[PDB]
Design a protein around this ligand. Sequence first.
Ligand code: HEM
Ligand SMILES: O=N[O-]
Ligand SMILES: O=N[O-]
Ligand SMILES: O=N[O-]
Ligand SMILES: O=N[O-]
Ligand SMILES: O=N[O-]
Ligand SMILES: O=N[O-]
Ligand SMILES: O=N[O-]
Ligand SMILES: O=N[O-]
Length: 153
Amino acid sequence: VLSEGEWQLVLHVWAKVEADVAGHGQDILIRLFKSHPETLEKFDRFKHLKTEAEMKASEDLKKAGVTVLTALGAILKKKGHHEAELKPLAQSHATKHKIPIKYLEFISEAIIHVLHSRHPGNFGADAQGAMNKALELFRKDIAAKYKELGYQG
Ligand code: HEM
Ligand SMILES: O=N[O-]
Ligand SMILES: O=N[O-]
Ligand SMILES: O=N[O-]
Ligand SMILES: O=N[O-]
Ligand SMILES: O=N[O-]
Ligand SMILES: O=N[O-]
Ligand SMILES: O=N[O-]
Ligand SMILES: O=N[O-]
């Protein structure tokens, strides 16, 4: 359970993300796909992309990045009261897309990497710790939902 001070660290860096959600989404998806190339295989519209340049030029990848970060943002803004948001997301990611928890860990690591690179003014150790706690909460609650839904994860 996060403190209010922890949530405020999360939401203060999130506010900078929101200055340019598309750009942050490109950087985050690209980092995930470079760091864990097996994750790209889940994305049928652009799994054929071979290079970072191709990835940066992809309008479909850009839209996916906007979608992920906007949904995550909405969850973070609930400050842990995210049961309603998590229901459809857990169902799609468990049953349609088949995203294991380990892949949710990889995208969390990609998020942290990019925020650390882009936002050293709002992403020092305490803020990174708060973001990691928020993302660990998200993953814990999604994993519990996966289990309810019948998915090993
Ligand atoms: C913070 C974690 C994540 C959030 C908030 C998120 C959110 C979303 C949302 C909102 C959509 C569109 C609606 C839906 O289908 O549910 C979506 C689609 C999808 N997500 Fe995620 N997602 C996350 C992590 C992942 C990860 C790690 C992968 C794969 C490694 C993944 C794969 C997909 C796929 C394949 C789609 C369908 C995209 C398409 O139609 O081409 N997601 N996700
Ligand atoms: O205010 N304690 O995070
Ligand atoms: O996408 N940078 O590792
Ligand atoms: O496609 N924006 O959430
Ligand atoms: O981009 N993960 O939906
Ligand atoms: O707390 N959301 O499952
Ligand atoms: O509300 N979940 O489908
Ligand atoms: O509800 N999953 O597409
Ligand atoms: O992409 N994680 O360092």
